[PDB]
A paper describes a structure:
In archaea, the [name] resides at the cytoplasmic face of the archaeal C-ring formed by the proteins ArlCDE and interacts with phosphorylated CheY. In archaea, CheY-P binds to [name], an adaptor protein uniquely present in archaeal species, however the precise mechanism of this interaction is unclear to date. Binding of CheY-P to [name] induces a rotational switch of the archaellum. [name] forms a twisted homodimer offering two CheY-P binding sites within an elongated C-terminal tail domain.
However, we could successfully use the dataset deposited by Paithankar and coworkers, to solve the structure of the [name] at 2.75 Å by molecular replacement (MR) using our initial MjCheF model and obtained a complete model of [name]. [name] consists of two N-terminal domains and a long C-terminal tail that reaches out from the center of the two domains and extends into a long tail domain of over ~80 Å in length. This second N-terminal domain consists of eight β-strands (i.e., β8-β15) and is connected to a small helical bundle (i.e., α2-α4) central to the two N-terminal domains. Helix α4 spans into an elongated C-terminal domain (CTD) that is formed by α5-α7, a long β-strand (i.e., β16) and the C-terminal helix α8. The asymmetric unit contained two [name] molecules, which interacted through their C-termini employing a buried surface area of 2700 A2. The strongest determinant of this interface is a substantial β-sheet, jointly being formed by the β16 strands of each of the [name] monomers. Moreover, both monomers of the [name] homodimer do not align symmetrically to each other but instead tilt their N-terminal domains by 90°. The residues involved in bending are E265 to L267 within helix α8 (obtained from DynDom47). This observation suggests that the [name] homodimer exhibits an intrinsic flexibility with respect to its N-terminal domains, which might be of functional relevance. Thus, our crystal structure suggests a [name] homodimer, which was confirmed in solution by mass photometry (MP).
Residue numbers in the entry:
A (entry chain A), B (entry chain B): 2 to 341
Write the structure that this text describes.
């Protein structure tokens, strides 16, 4: 097999009155066309389930806390519709004991699932169709395939996991690195009306606009899921092109509402600190604007920082003369060494 | 003997032109009229100088650092003029080898010399001749004698070594407790006009000027040395009596000049920080007035404090948003929960 992992597996049946999922001991194997789950009693195998990629509806889905086992560890849910049973949520998660479970090995296992789903899937690409607001007449549609790789440049030169477009006779195009993204319809230069993606991405030396169409609707969802998971900064751009995907409009709506409630619940004083420091008020003077003492503000600065919200750039210290410090100054005056 | 000390003794002569002092080893005896030094080699008495308390010019003289044997140990210098030979400076110190000398019987040895020289000497007192600037003519001349004791009462109520005037059938007068001092000399003293001391002192309730005439001018020098030695705070108000005591005015000149040089040696920067803080400039803003960076001012603060001149009153920390702080503040106005 491509990859294995010893793991806890829970299967939901994902229906109303979702009963508590039952977790079993198994080792999970990635094949070319399926995930096979081999269940364990002691060290032995009692049975197995095969889950075809033919039936993979969605992956990387949002796991309710009611369905989490061991909320410290990470959970990964893959949703299939197998025709006989129905729509299933298969969730994989590792357990604490270090002699059975390995987090990095599990972390690779989930990544290989994306790699198998995405690598080699077909895509048509028209590279750099505007330059400086003028449409490139040398820009032709190219056929190619997706490849999940680490793209090491940005315009920032920060290495980031992404998906590139492999094209015949030219090295891959880093179509998801440095973005803006809208979605448009297009007359294919060969002739089809296509439901394609318009990407304003920072290309080789200049901001550019290229058109990208992924025929398989499923692999589009796969691509979006992975770009979210391993690069959460992008959550903005793709949410603009996220409407075609009901499972995402839902989850984005759900997280938005939780974020609202979380921000409501935050301490009003601490929210005030963040906005004032963000706007540019001197931290040494901030207590003066918010109507609070030096002692109390520094204590609140201590409660932040613990929360990871603030960082110390520098410690200033309020100092005063000792009796020996005064002895010097009074000597200087007595001998006519200072004016006052 | 009244008291003895085995010490390391060094003698300097105005007759010997070379500045050298050789530290012989001896026992030295306090007598009624003299101090006798039986010199000691291999624990055996090879020589003996007898130093009368008559022709004891001065004691507690300031010792040049050129003449100090062991700069840790105390050096007590007693100066005699022996007419056949000249002016002698006998310097007393110890090596405080823990079984041949000891520190604490040394520090008392010097004090007992003052006690022997001062106790019982005739003195004459006109107590509280001025109250509020008004002449008290119930204040008469009383004759008595001096005594070396610790006088508790001051305005700080803190005990201090001092000298009192004993009068028959009256408690002692603590004439050197809380003081200012001029020399008037015109007072008649129930007879011939004679040079006396005008002493402003707090006494019981009120700023009071009393007159004190110590007939023996050598005894006068001894009480002044004693007060200077064991209450060096008393130095001020004395120097108006630095006239008529030349060796005292010389030592005052040399101290102040050595102080002004020391002050000029201090860092120019640190002195201005000391004066500015003494004036009342905010320590957080002081770097601004001196045209210095915050990093350097806090560095200089740390070099001070160590030297004992400054003390931290409060710790203020300049604080900045983290990446997580920005996420929250970005989300707040992203959802319009904060107005900027």
């Amino acid at each position: 097999p491509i990859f294995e992992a010893r793991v806890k597996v829970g299967i939901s049946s994902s229906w109303v009155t979702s009963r508590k999922v039952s977790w079993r001991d198994a080792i999970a194997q990635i094949e070319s066309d399926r995930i096979v789950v081999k269940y364990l009693k002691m060290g032995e195998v009692v049975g197995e389930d095969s889950f075809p990629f033919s039936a993979l509806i969605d992956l990387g889905v949002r796991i309710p806390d009611e369905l989490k086992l061991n909320p410290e560890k990470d959970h990964f849910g893959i949703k299939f519709y197998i025709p006989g049973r129905g729509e299933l949520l298969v969730i994989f998660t590792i357990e604490e004991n270090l002699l059975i479970y390995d987090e990095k090995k599990f972390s690779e296992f989930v990544h290989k699932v994306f790699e198998v789903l995405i690598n080699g899937k077909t895509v048509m690409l028209q590279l750099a169709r505007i330059i400086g607001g003028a449409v490139n007449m040398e820009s032709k549609w190219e056929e190619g395939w997706l490849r999940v790789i680490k793209v090491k440049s940005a315009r920032t030169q920060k290495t980031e996991r992404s998906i590139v477009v492999i094209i015949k006779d030219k090295r891959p195009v880093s179509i998801f690195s440095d973005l803006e993204d809208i979605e448009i319809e297009e007359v294919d230069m060969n002739g089809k009306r296509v439901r394609a993606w318009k990407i304003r991405h920072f290309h080789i030396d200049q901001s550019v606009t290229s058109y990208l169409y992924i025929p398989d609707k499923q692999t589009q969802l796969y691509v979006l899921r992975y770009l979210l998971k391993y690069n959460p900064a992008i959550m903005e751009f793709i949410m603009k092109v996220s409407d075609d995907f009901p499972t995402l409009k839902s989850e984005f709506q759900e997280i938005m509402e939780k974020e609202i409630k979380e921000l409501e619940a935050l301490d009003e004083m601490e929210k005030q600190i963040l906005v004032a420091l963000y706007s540019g008020i001197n931290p040494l003077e901030l207590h003066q604007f918010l109507g609070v003492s030096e002692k109390e503000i520094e204590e609140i600065y201590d409660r932040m920082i613990d929360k990871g919200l603030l960082k110390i750039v520098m410690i200033r210290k309020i100092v005063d003369l000792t009796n020996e410090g005064r002895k010097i100054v009074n000597k200087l005056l007595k001998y006519g060494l200072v004016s006052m």
